[PDB]
DNA sequence: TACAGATCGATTATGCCCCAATAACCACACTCAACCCATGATGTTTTTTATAATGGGAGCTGTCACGGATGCA
């Protein structure tokens, strides 16, 4: 997978609602990784590694 | 005149003293280990060092996706 920024989605992970949870992803060539995530309550969350 | 026997003289038997090997039984012996006791060379362990030194992450891990509990807040 090439270094850069990629965006993804979820297809039925949250069975309670069935919403689509988009997320962003930063993967450098070397170094720590950065992720941006949504929630069913529509809130932004981050994750490192 | 025809027909008999009769003793010299030879192969066969049977046994054993020796004896030229036969075997067990007893006598004395050197050489080669085996273990030990040192001498010493090699090995192994302990001790100390006084300018000053005062908080790593070591390479993460790279990302699957079910279910069943589960411990909370």
Chain B, protein-covered positions (CB within 7 A): 60-63
Using a 7 A cutoff on CB, list residues near strand B. A 1, 25, 27, 32-33, 35, 49
d(CA A40, CA A19) in angstroms, rounded, equals 7
d(CA A3, CA A30) in angstroms, rounded, equals 9
d(CA A2, CA A44) in angstroms, rounded, equals 25
Report whether A23 contacts A35 (CB < 8 A): yes
Pick the closest to residue A19 from A27, A33, A9, A5 (CA basis).
Answer: A9
d(CA A10, CA A31) in angstroms, rounded, equals 26
Backbone conformation region of residue A42, classed left if phi is above 0, alpha if psi is from -120 to 50, else beta: left
CA-atom Rg of chain A in angstroms = 12
Please report which residue ranges of A1-49 form alpha helices under DSSP H.
none
Residues near A39 by beta carbon (within 8 Å), at least 6 away in sequence: A21, A45
């Amino acid at each position: 997978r090439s270094p850069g920024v990629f965006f993804d989605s979820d297809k039925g992970k949250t069975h309670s609602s069935g919403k689509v949870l988009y997320n962003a992803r930063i993967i450098p060539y070397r170094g720590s990784w950065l992720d941006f995530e949504f929630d069913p309550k529509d809130n932004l969350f981050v994750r490192i590694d």
